[PDB]
Structure 1
Amino acid sequence: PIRHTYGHIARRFGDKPATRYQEASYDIEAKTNFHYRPQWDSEHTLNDPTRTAIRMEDWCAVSDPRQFYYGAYVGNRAKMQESAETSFGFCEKRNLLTRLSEETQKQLLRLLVPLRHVELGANMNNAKIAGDATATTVSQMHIYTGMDRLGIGQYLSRIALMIDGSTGAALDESKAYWMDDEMWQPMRKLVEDTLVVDDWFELTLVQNILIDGMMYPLVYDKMDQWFESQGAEDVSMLTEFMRDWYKESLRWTNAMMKAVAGESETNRELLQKWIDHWEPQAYEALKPLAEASVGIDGLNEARAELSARLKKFELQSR
């Protein structure tokens, strides 16, 4: 054995056998000597860390504690998908959602299924970040989460198809709540506004921290427990995937915030300027949804959880 691992890995972690995650994730990207300036961007180069105003000595200080390289991510997701598939097959066969009252069904179509639209936004947002972040340790976490959002929307989409016997009539309906129903317009406005943010790290904070960090606990915890009182508890089996996934996403989104905030006072004040402009827009997007369901103290108890978590990064909310 001439050597234990590749040069870039050995420079980083010592000359000894390295992990699969390490050999998949560090220093794989092109970094310098690009041949042509982007025809779609006048301000930056191919693979430019200055696409964010956030500054890092080494972006690989952001690392995934789940240690997801491609194989590890799909293997973990396959096992989660088999579970959800168990749950869905069972609800379908036992008629758990078709047997519900048309009013309970409309609750699910109005309060829950239109989330697929936010999952869609989150998909495009994480796609842009995978394309803009330079370090593989960062960019790959964003493609994964992105394809996850697509998956999560397909599940919410399948709730509606189980209700409508696979006609799409409940998707048609649901989608009209999202287009037309005053309750969803602050969300829908916020989603479309995220689509227009240039700074990839602003985007990740807003999407994967501020919006998700309040919406996940409101929806899959609080609005979930409330569905029992509503006759709708059997849908809880269909949204386990979303709960498991949110709990796992805390692991990497926290370590990414910890590292980036911890890096420099000047990052912490960039972040804080962005939180102040966005977290109240997150909050106010979710207010109509929380008062049409579990009631606003559910939302405030989620703002609680978010602000608390932000303080662990020396950052603040309200």
Structure 2
Amino acid sequence: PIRHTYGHIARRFGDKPATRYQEASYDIEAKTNFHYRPQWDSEHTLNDPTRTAIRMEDWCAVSDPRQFYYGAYVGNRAKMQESAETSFGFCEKRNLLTRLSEETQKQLLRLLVPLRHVELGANMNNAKIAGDATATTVSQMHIYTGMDRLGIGQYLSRIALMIDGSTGAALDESKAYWMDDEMWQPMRKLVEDTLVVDDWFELTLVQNILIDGMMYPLVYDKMDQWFESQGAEDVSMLTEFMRDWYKESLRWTNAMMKAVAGESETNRELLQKWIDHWEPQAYEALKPLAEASVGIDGLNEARAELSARLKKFELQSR
């Protein structure tokens, strides 16, 4: 061999054999000499790092600890869906959802299934981020997490289809709660407000850290325990995918936050201003759900867990 890797990889890592992740993920994007300004943006170029107020000398400081290029992502997901699909077939063949009481089924349609709308919101926000971030290391983590949100939304929808014998009536019932029930309106308002945020790192902070960082613990940990007291323990086998996904998501989201916050005090002051604005809204969005189920204590526990996580970045919340 005349050389061991591509020139752009050798500049970063040395002329030595490189990993599949390295060759897939660094310096592949177009960086300069764009021919035309966007017809849809007056302030920024194509591929413009200034789409966020966050500043980085090298956005490739954000690397994925999971080392997910496409092949490793789908490989990992295919393994996880094999178990989820089997649990769905098992519950469906033994009538584990349809044999629950009518009150229990209504609790699931009202408190769990409308989270598929929140997942849709997260899918859209992450698609936005993937189209707006410059570095391939950052943009691919956002499309993978985006498609994951769609898939989680689809598993939630299937819980309702299982309850209704595959007619759609339960999904209709559950959408009416999302649209018209007072308990969901703070969350619906919050999700719609995120859809209008311009700065992509503000958006990733709010969606992938603040909302998910409290919501996932609240729902798939705290309400999960509560559902067992309500006779719905068997739903836990259908929501195991969400717990495993979330534990995995901590790895890249914490890695990204450490790199950005550790870059500069000016970055930290920006992130804190955004935490101070948005973190209380995430708490207020979740409060009616928590008080309709596990209780407010379960939400304060989730809020304190996020506060402790934010200390890893030298940031804080209440």
TM-superposed deviation, 1:158: 0.3
Corresponding residue SS for 1:108: helix
Q: Deviations over 1:169-221 (max 9, x none)?
A: 00000000000000000000000000000000000000000000000000000
Counterpart Cα distance in 1 of 2:175 and 2:279:
25
Counterpart Cα distance in 2 of 1:141 and 1:201:
13
Q: Deviations over 1:41-60 (max 9, x none)?
A: 00000000000000000000
Task: Give TM-score, length-normalised by structure 1.
Answer: 1.00
Counterpart Cα distance in 1 of 2:224 and 2:283:
18
Counterpart Cα distance in 2 of 1:312 and 1:136:
25
What aligned pairs does 1:65-214 form with structure 2 within 5 A after superposition? 65-214=65-214
Q: Deviations over 1:86-120 (max 9, x none)?
A: 11000000000000111100000000000000000
Counterpart Cα distance in 2 of 1:258 and 1:298:
27
Q: Unpaired segments of 5 or more residues in structure 1? A: none
- Which residue number in structure 2 is paired with residue 309 of structure 1? 309
TM-superposed deviation, 1:12: 0.3
TM-superposed deviation, 1:68: 0.2
Counterpart Cα distance in 1 of 2:298 and 2:250:
20
Corresponding residue SS for 1:222: helix
Counterpart Cα distance in 2 of 1:284 and 1:144:
28
Q: Deviations over 1:232-290 (max 9, x none)?
A: 00000000000000000000000000000000000000000000000000000000000
Counterpart Cα distance in 2 of 1:262 and 1:75:
32
Counterpart Cα distance in 2 of 1:243 and 1:106:
23
- How many residues are paired up? 318
- Which residue number in structure 2 is paired with residue 42 of structure 1? 42
Counterpart Cα distance in 1 of 2:13 and 2:87:
43
TM-superposed deviation, 1:64: 0.2
TM-superposed deviation, 1:295: 0.1
Counterpart Cα distance in 2 of 1:168 and 1:260:
44
Counterpart Cα distance in 2 of 1:317 and 1:158:
36
TM-superposed deviation, 1:224: 0.3
TM-superposed deviation, 1:300: 0.3
Corresponding residue SS for 2:119: helix
- Which residue number in structure 1 is paired with residue 61 of structure 2? 61
Q: Deviations over 1:116-144 (max 9, x none)?
A: 00000000000000000000000000000
Moved >4 Å (runs of 4+): none
Corresponding residue SS for 1:262: helix
Counterpart Cα distance in 2 of 1:94 and 1:214:
33
TM-superposed deviation, 1:20: 0.0
- Which residue number in structure 1 is paired with residue 292 of structure 2? 292
Task: Give TM-score, length-normalised by structure 2.
Answer: 1.00
Counterpart Cα distance in 2 of 1:80 and 1:30:
34
TM-superposed deviation, 1:38: 0.3
Corresponding residue SS for 2:90: helix
Counterpart Cα distance in 2 of 1:16 and 1:103:
63
TM-superposed deviation, 1:24: 0.0
TM-superposed deviation, 1:10: 0.2
- Which residue number in structure 2 is paired with residue 267 of structure 1? 267
Percent identity over the alignment is: 100
Counterpart Cα distance in 1 of 2:86 and 2:280:
38
TM-superposed deviation, 1:166: 0.5
- CA-based RMSD of the aligned residues comes to 0.3
